[PDB]
Ligand binder design. Structure first.
Ligand SMILES: CCOP(=O)(COc1ccc(C[C@H](NC(=O)O[C@H]2CO[C@H]3OCC[C@H]32)[C@H](O)CN(CC(CC)CC)S(=O)(=O)c2ccc3c(c2)OCO3)cc1)OCC
Lengths: 99, 99
């Protein structure tokens, strides 16, 4: 589809057996999701933005479905105020910017 | 242009007669630039990101040219980690997400 930017580009995603709403975020290198108890091993990480850094748990090789487009990659879990789909997964679903 | 997301979507902008690099950021409601001198009146504002809130200077009706496309709108100036072009201006240059 084509998503205009009058409002926040929110879409439904499926991860770890659950449905959620997440932002398609071209400014995000990585994908950051609200706190959730995924299984498996993880590695600590810190990611920075406006306001400073937050601590997150890096899970690798996680499947996410974004508007029916499947994508598997690294997902960070932590106290983010919003679920954020970053470029690591946006590339996998063929997402481009166009003007 | 059509911009893929394997690299950061960085572009050259022209504001206050000065060229800069900025990130096309569909996850930002507003446009936030690193500290710089801009003419005209401004009002203290605050914006929240991944790591909390910062203090910024709000400039309204600022002329800014993005990858050859002109926009006139609100530009926030403050301690952001990177120059970001937010949806308030992405809409003006006709930017959409597509996949
Ligand atoms: C909504 C309820 O909470 P809230 O109101 C705001 O919550 C939000 C809403 C949107 C975002 C997304 C964020 N947007 C943003 O900062 O925009 C602000 C300016 O415009 C305003 O409009 C929205 C917020 C304001 C960027 O798109 C992406 N970011 C990087 C970018 C930072 C400049 C470039 C470096 S990143 O998230 O930090 C990040 C992600 C993965 C990474 C990484 C860094 O590093 C490696 O991987 C984050 C928090 O207040 C909370 C205190």
């Amino acid at each position: 589809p084509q998503i205009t930017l009058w409002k926040r580009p929110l879409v439904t995603i499926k991860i770890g057996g659950q449905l959620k709403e997440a932002l398609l975020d071209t400014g995000a290198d990585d994908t950051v999701l609200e706190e959730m108890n995924l299984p498996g091993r993880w590695k600590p990480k810190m990611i920075g933005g406006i306001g400073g850094f937050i601590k997150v748990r890096q899970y690798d090789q996680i499947l996410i479905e974004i508007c029916g487009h499947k994508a598997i990659g690294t997902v960070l879990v932590g106290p983010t105020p919003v679920n954020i789909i970053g470029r690591n997964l946006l590339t996998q679903i063929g997402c481009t910017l166009n003007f």
